[PDB]
Design a protein around this ligand. Structure first.
Ligand code: BCL
Ligand code: BCL
Ligand code: BCL
Ligand code: BCL
Ligand code: BCL
Ligand code: BCL
Ligand code: G2O
Ligand code: G2O
Ligand SMILES: CCCCCCCCCCCCCCCCCC(=O)OC[C@H](CO[C@@H]1O[C@H](CO)[C@H](O)[C@H](O)[C@H]1O)OC(=O)CCCCCCCCCCCCCCCCC
Ligand SMILES: CCCCCCCCCCCCCCCCCC(=O)OC[C@H](CO[C@@H]1O[C@H](CO)[C@H](O)[C@H](O)[C@H]1O)OC(=O)CCCCCCCCCCCCCCCCC
Ligand SMILES: [Ca+2]
Ligand SMILES: [Ca+2]
Lengths: 625, 95, 625
């Protein structure tokens, strides 16, 4: 898994790999396009809805390619347009992959004319001289998109910020500024000088971490934008549609096949039609799009910091770490700012989550009337300040806890990230003794001083991912309407059904944090497809414990004993058929494999919370008196 | 050959990374317990009658306590295969 | 937690501690007795039902102390008898604790006469000479119990094995044989000679492991016995009673307190009466009693083996391990039987659980019709052999998987136990290299050879407990009627609603393995008391990960950084108020603490499965056609 490491590639192979990946992306987008076909223009009843196309259908309908109708002409035209666009994507992707071949093997030669080409001039020597012309290159992409819309899809550029004609107008406005910004940087490159020397690890890490925040920004922008009246024709026109998915509860069949089955439906094993407006499909698609960019955005951030540490450690081993003028290094090359900076962030993280966790248990205590308490004794009055109540619809206590859980969750993960940034080579305790860090992946140093597990910077990356689950999962509850304000809600035990009315919620949330699991899984158990995902997700997750506990030496015991059984068992039952000697993962591989099973297993199940319906009512739930 | 390697006793912590690189035909590196292995009581050592001067033990840059030295053939003593140039530092504030 | 270790105590202190513990047991039993009072003989409306007395109520009713009635005379007499017995218990417990004082401090002197007493003669020198007179001592306990019943409680000894008079008859029969067996061992002591030298660790470990299997035996005996027609007057007379517990759903109160509350019940915040025959109370108490002895029995077994290893390691360090003629040592002092014995047990464990797990997934696949399969393709025909169908009521596939899961679960834990027994000092791999084990609690040896975690015998004990959870939990499902045969059942997805029809189950189980959680928690969420236990159990459990992952060195990082923040924060916010320097558990303490949170957290929740009702119907569930 280090075959494509950065210190082994030169500059051209990056361009070739990027071009090849763009071609692959074009292929898969075309695949999606023909996966979204309904009728096959020649007429061949096509495919049923799947989650891959339903995610992009609003964008197509906005562009006048697909449509929301079931007629003769409409589906015939939509299928033809989709086939044309898929073929165009296939062609451009093939060309791009061929260009990837051309740039990967140092062979920039024209096929028609016997010409050659030097990657140096054709220009730029360093990356700051390359920032410039790229902005000119992007100005062409914006210019082309405005041309493609206007010439092919109609939609003349008009500055009306309620219809899509504004998008065409904006692409021309942006091409003006990116071009104008492009020339100036071509004549005046900017200067963070250290990113040019080890430019394929340092500059890469900064970009990856910067892209991470960008993805989170578009994650939040989409959630707000898609719920506007302007976006209504493309998103909650989904509600008054009927969807046929794969894995739907099908037309059941008895053992008489005779066999009085189902509703009156001619196909046997037919897929039942599922209404998309009792099913909250308009919000389900919005949640799916938003969550994808949020979790991917966070992961890019962790990776960008981790690779910065790999570079940061390297310049401390040869000697250049002492040797930087970039202020991005001198602000932390002191070992007394690091403690102050890490101290002030680990205390703020202490002050914040203790505050919300005190509120959450106190609300939970007040419902169940533990220790003789009423719900009137809870924090049912802690609304956000009136200057902050514009960012919320129906401001209440549920918003107050959310705005702070995100802070508490974020700073909890920042502790690991800072400890990657600063203590890559030495820590105050490791320099307190006489000790090193030399490999950024060494698992431990032994049982000395009570234990030295997980001090390397790769391990610190694992804990940031593990601590980031709480922050990421809090988003899934909030966007699905889960009342994170108390840990039980709608429970018919003592007072959970009272929150409604003493707080004037004016909505109705699904449940509490625990009661979230009992509800929602009413629909998960109804679908066989969703049911298998539930079983697989839980199976993958707990296997993490096999490699995350302090047991690697114990597993090295049995592998030796095993090897001798399959060795003594090919001895007197069957004849000589055995030479295999069992391998056990090392501690470094154990944590790498463990973190993927833990992180992968939990989020394959989060998909079920989002892709099973919305189910948030608007009934104030009258008192349980 | 020349340039022996000589694990330091008092600095070793017993991480064992030095022991990994020594070729299996050459078990020149070993362990010594003499006590409970949690407060530093399993420090390792090098057998000089089996070592063949691979430099895998020194050139790998793995020892975190500076316990491997690699004394030079004539009289010189190393501690790590290259050391940064020991500058000295202050604080700045652009006014 | 080694203040009372065995190598520091002499022989008398054991007797003193045992006497003191017996006195404490008498005190707590009296406490239970007066916890089970209803009316207080002078008349003071007493206590409500709690799980501690409801566990012992059938035994009292069998002995004619308590009763199943609500009248004037009955409760008055029962309260008086319970008070008398509690006072008697208090008196005897005080006497026993005083005798514990007398034996703990080497002071066997008569208070009335100025006499002394030698622990040697008053006799026995070694423990085999003590086995003898103990059997004579126990013959007196059996003799006394027959006297206590006959003289006080009536119940003349009559050999009728359908009423309790047989118990009185048996205690006299046993006193004959234990006395007769006592004399012979007084004249002919038996001989496993090694248990006399280090007699307070070796002999203790054998007894503890032997008691473990005894507890499991009475665990299974009680489950069968309590469901007989002879035991009907004391166990399923519980069904046609009405119970008032603590933590019941109480008489709710509105905010008008006015306040139209509830049913017509004069107390406000009154405890609602709960019928004990819709609630499966007759089986709930039986399940509670049985499971307590099973899990305690298993734990004694693990401890008995673990302490045998502590002794076994010690005799290998000084040198006596080579020095035993007890056959219980020579049968494994060879290092070629150990591999064969461990090989043949790790292969049988391989052959068994792979068989059941293949059956369970195949049944689960067949319901949901994954890969185009029917339920007719499942193992709905694999009943136990007709010579084995007497031990089951309604033999079916659910019994076949249970009888093998227990074997698969048991042998899975035996691997750790054997590796405690044999590889305490050296293992084939550890002797393959040049290496030792010297402390039975050392956590690891460092990252050498890829990692050496959890090889000591204390760590092997932790894995036996962790692997034993699967075997122990399988009992909870089975005795609660959970259909462990397939992992989904009663689910309205594809074919899980059938099952009974195609198999002629003649009963109706609650659910499948996964669907077990969604059901059952209908009642858990109804009670506020059970709800708090649910939240606490899950909070304790996941904290195990903080100390079970390879992170002890990482936690040693922050403790140093923390110490400097509470150090730099008492600097310029408040004045000098800080000298505290944070301690982090060592790896050995981390695993000890981690295993208790994991094991303790999971079984506080298993209590909810048992103590929430039975809910097993007898309706064959007609086909879902
Ligand atoms: C938003 C776009 C992301 C991006 C997304 C990806 C993805 C996705 C991949 C790469 C891959 C690679 N990227 Mg890139 N990459 C970006 C910016 C960079 C920068 C930089 C700014 O300096 C550099 C040096 C690289 C360098 C590389 C090489 C490590 C590798 C290409 C060779 C290959 O096999 O294909 N990327 C931007 C930040 N890059 C490919 C790879 O090899 O991954 C191992 C890969 O799959
Ligand atoms: C979107 C366009 C793709 C791309 C797609 C292709 C394809 C496809 C081809 C070339 C080929 C060439 N490209 Mg080009 N090429 C790109 C970016 C570059 C860059 C750069 C960023 O510095 C350089 C130096 C080149 C240089 C070259 C020459 C090696 C060569 C023929 C000269 C010519 O067409 O002009 N390309 C961009 C990323 N380029 C052509 C070639 O060499 O044919 C033998 C070829 O087939
Ligand atoms: C490498 C050293 C040059 C540099 C010159 C360029 C050039 C040239 C380009 C980028 C590119 C990117 N740079 Mg840079 N980059 C540097 C300093 C920075 C800094 C900073 C100091 O904080 C940041 C946040 C960024 C971040 C970024 C992203 C905004 C942008 C595209 C992301 C990606 O996928 O690629 N650069 C320094 C000034 N950077 C690409 C871009 O999109 O520019 C608009 C690009 O073409
Ligand atoms: C079924 C009864 C169990 C039993 C159950 C307990 C329990 C329960 C306890 C002891 C406790 C102890 N047992 Mg005991 N113990 C039994 C048989 C033995 C045997 C033996 C057969 O040789 C020995 C040497 C001991 C020895 C001891 C000491 C370790 C200790 C008493 C001192 C004290 O503080 O009180 N037990 C039998 C097997 N024993 C007490 C102790 O100290 O635990 C740390 C304690 O709590
Ligand atoms: C169930 C009975 C308890 C017990 C409860 C008591 C109590 C209570 C007392 C003694 C006291 C005595 N017991 Mg006693 N004693 C027990 C078992 C023993 C054993 C033994 C197993 O080997 C021995 C040697 C003794 C020996 C003794 C003498 C030290 C002493 C007075 C002699 C006498 O009463 O007779 N007991 C059993 C376990 N024993 C008495 C004493 O010493 O008073 C100063 C005292 O108060
Ligand atoms: C210590 C060395 C003597 C010995 C003599 C005694 C004596 C004397 C007694 C016990 C006691 C017990 N012994 Mg022992 N015990 C030995 C060998 C054994 C062996 C075996 C070889 O397998 C076993 C399974 C046991 C098991 C047991 C339990 C059956 C019994 C009570 C359990 C407890 O809590 O205390 N002993 C050898 C023979 N054992 C107690 C018991 O109950 O005996 C009936 C007791 O009084
Ligand atoms: C279902 C989960 C698990 C197993 C399956 C298992 C199997 C196993 N384990 Mg394990 N294990 C844990 C989970 C599992 N450990 C956890 C969660 C912990 C942390 C507490 C843990 C810890 C230890 C320690 C410390 C040790 C071991 C061992 C040891 C070996 C013992 C050999 C044996 O019993 O033979 C019997 C082994 C079998 C019968 C295995 C057959 C199964 C069938 C194919 C089921 C399929 C499995 C799976 C569904 C398919 C994989 C698909 C996936 C990739 C999508 C044996 C291979 C030991 C050894 O490695 O050597 C002895 C050892 O020392 N463990
Ligand atoms: C709810 C569970 C957890 C915490 C609460 C917590 C707290 C904590 N952890 Mg943790 N942790 C895990 C769970 C928890 N780790 C898990 C499951 C893993 C395995 C993946 C794990 C792993 C690491 C590693 C590897 C490291 C740490 C640390 C570190 C410290 C960071 C300092 C900080 O962020 O200040 C902020 C700390 C707080 C705001 C703590 C305040 C809470 C309030 C009082 C809530 C009450 C807590 C509880 C309910 C009461 C106890 C009752 C119980 C006994 C019945 C900080 C004390 C690090 C350090 O030790 O030093 C930096 C470190 O290196 N972890
Ligand atoms: C670091 C410190 C940053 C401090 C910033 C505080 C975060 C504020 C979060 C609350 C904002 C909010 O809810 O927006 C308010 C808006 C809408 O606001 C309310 O939202 C409610 C949601 O149930 C309803 O939609 C209501 O209609 C609406 O009034 O909520 C969103 O749609 C937010 C989108 C998701 C935001 C994810 C943030 C990404 C953080 C993930 C990092 C985890 C690691
Ligand atoms: C080691 C190898 C030992 C092999 C022994 C095979 C175990 C057989 C188990 C099935 C026996 C059985 O179910 O009994 C059959 C009896 C009754 O049998 C059936 O039981 C059904 C239960 O749903 C119903 O009650 C039916 O009425 C009855 O017919 O079941 C019990 O009551 C068993 C009690 C619980 C047994 C626990 C065993 C302890 C093991 C725990 C160790 C885990 C570690
Ligand atoms: Ca949902
Ligand atoms: Ca139950």
């Amino acid at each position: 898994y280090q075959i494509f490491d950065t210190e082994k590639l030169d500059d051209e192979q990056v361009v070739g790999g990027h071009l090849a990946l763009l071609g692959v992306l074009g292929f898969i987008m075309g695949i999606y396009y023909i996966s979204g076909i309904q009728v096959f223009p020649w007429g061949a009843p096509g495919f049923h809805d799947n989650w891959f196309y339903l995610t992009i259908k609003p964008r197509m309908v906005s562009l006048g390619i697909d449509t929301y109708s079931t007629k003769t002409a409409d589906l015939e035209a939509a299928g033809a347009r989709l086939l044309g666009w898929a073929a165009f994507h296939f062609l451009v992707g093939s060309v791009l992959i061929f260009g990837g071949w051309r740039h990967w093997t140092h062979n920039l030669t024209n096929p028609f004319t016997g010409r050659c080409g030097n990657f140096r001039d054709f220009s730029a020597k360093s990356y700051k001289e390359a920032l410039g012309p790229h902005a000119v290159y992007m100005s062409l992409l914006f210019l082309g998109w405005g041309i493609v819309m206007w010439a092919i899809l109609g939609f003349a550029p008009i500055p009306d910020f309620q219809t899509i004609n504004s998008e065409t107008f904006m692409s021309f406005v942006f091409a003006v500024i990116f071009f104008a910004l492009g020339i100036y940087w071509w004549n005046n490159p900017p200067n963070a000088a250290i990113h040019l020397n080890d430019d394929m690890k340092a500059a890469f890490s900064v970009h990856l971490t910067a892209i991470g925040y960008i993805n989170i920004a578009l994650g939040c922008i989409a959630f707000v934008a898609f719920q506007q009246p302007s976006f209504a024709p493309y998103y909650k026109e989904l509600d008054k549609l009927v969807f046929y998915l794969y894995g739907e509860p099908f037309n059941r069949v008895s053992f008489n096949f005779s066999g009085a089955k189902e509703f009156a439906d001619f196909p046997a094993y037919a897929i039942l039609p599922k209404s998309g407006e009792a099913f909250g499909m308009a919000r389900v698609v919005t949640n799916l799009i938003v969550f994808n960019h949020i979790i991917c955005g966070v992961l890019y951030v962790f990776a960008g910091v981790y690779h910065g540490g790999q570079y940061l450690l390297k310049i401390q081993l040869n000697g250049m770490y002492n040797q930087i003028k970039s202020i991005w290094i001198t602000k932390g090359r002191d070992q007394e700012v690091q403690v102050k900076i890490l101290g002030t962030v680990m205390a703020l993280c202490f002050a914040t989550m203790l505050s919300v966790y005190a509120v959450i248990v106190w609300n939970t205590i007040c419902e169940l009337n533990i220790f003789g308490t009423n719900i009137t004794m809870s924090f049912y009055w802690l609304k956000p300040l009136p200057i902050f109540q514009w960012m919320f619809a129906d401001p209440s206590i549920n918003d107050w806890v959310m705005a702070h859980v995100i802070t508490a969750g974020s700073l909890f993960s920042l502790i690991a990230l800072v400890r990657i940034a600063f203590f890559a080579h030495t820590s105050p305790l490791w320099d307190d003794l006489g000790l090193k860090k030399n490999s950024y992946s060494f698992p431990c140093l032994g049982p000395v001083y009570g234990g030295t597990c997980g001090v390397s910077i790769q391990d610190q990356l694992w804990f940031a991912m593990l601590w980031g689950i709480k922050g990421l999962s809090a988003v899934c509850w909030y966007i699905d309407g889960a009342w994170i304000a108390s840990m039980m809600y709608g429970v018919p035990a003592a007072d959970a059904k009272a929150w409604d009315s003493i707080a004037h919620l004016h909505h109705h949330y699904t449940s509490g944090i625990f009661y979230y699991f009992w509800t929602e899984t009413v629909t998960i158990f109804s679908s066989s497809h969703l049911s298998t995902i539930l079983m697989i997700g839980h199976l993958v997750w707990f296997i993490s414990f096999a490699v995350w506990f302090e047991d690697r030496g114990s597993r090295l015991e049995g592998a030796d004993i095993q090897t001798r059984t399959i060795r003594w068992l090919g001895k007197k039952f069957l004849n000589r058929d055995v030479n295999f000697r069992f391998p056990v993962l090392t501690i470094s591989d154990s944590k790498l494999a463990g973190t993927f099973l833990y992180f992968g297993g939990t989020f394959m199940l989060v998909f079920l919370f989002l892709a099973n319906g919305f189910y948030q009512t608007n009934s104030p739930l009258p008192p349980p008196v | 050959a020349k340039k022996h390697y000589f694990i330091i006793e008092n600095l070793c912590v017993g991480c064992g990374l030095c022991l990994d690189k020594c070729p299996p035909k050459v078990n020149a590196i070993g362990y010594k317990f003499y006590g409970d292995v949690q407060e530093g009581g399993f420090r390792c050592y090098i057998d000089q009658a089996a070592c063949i001067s691979c430099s895998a033990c020194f050139s790998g840059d793995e020892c975190p306590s500076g316990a491997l030295i690699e004394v030079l053939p004539d009289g010189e003593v190393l501690d790590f295969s290259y050391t940064p140039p020991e500058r000295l530092d202050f604080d700045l504030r652009f006014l």
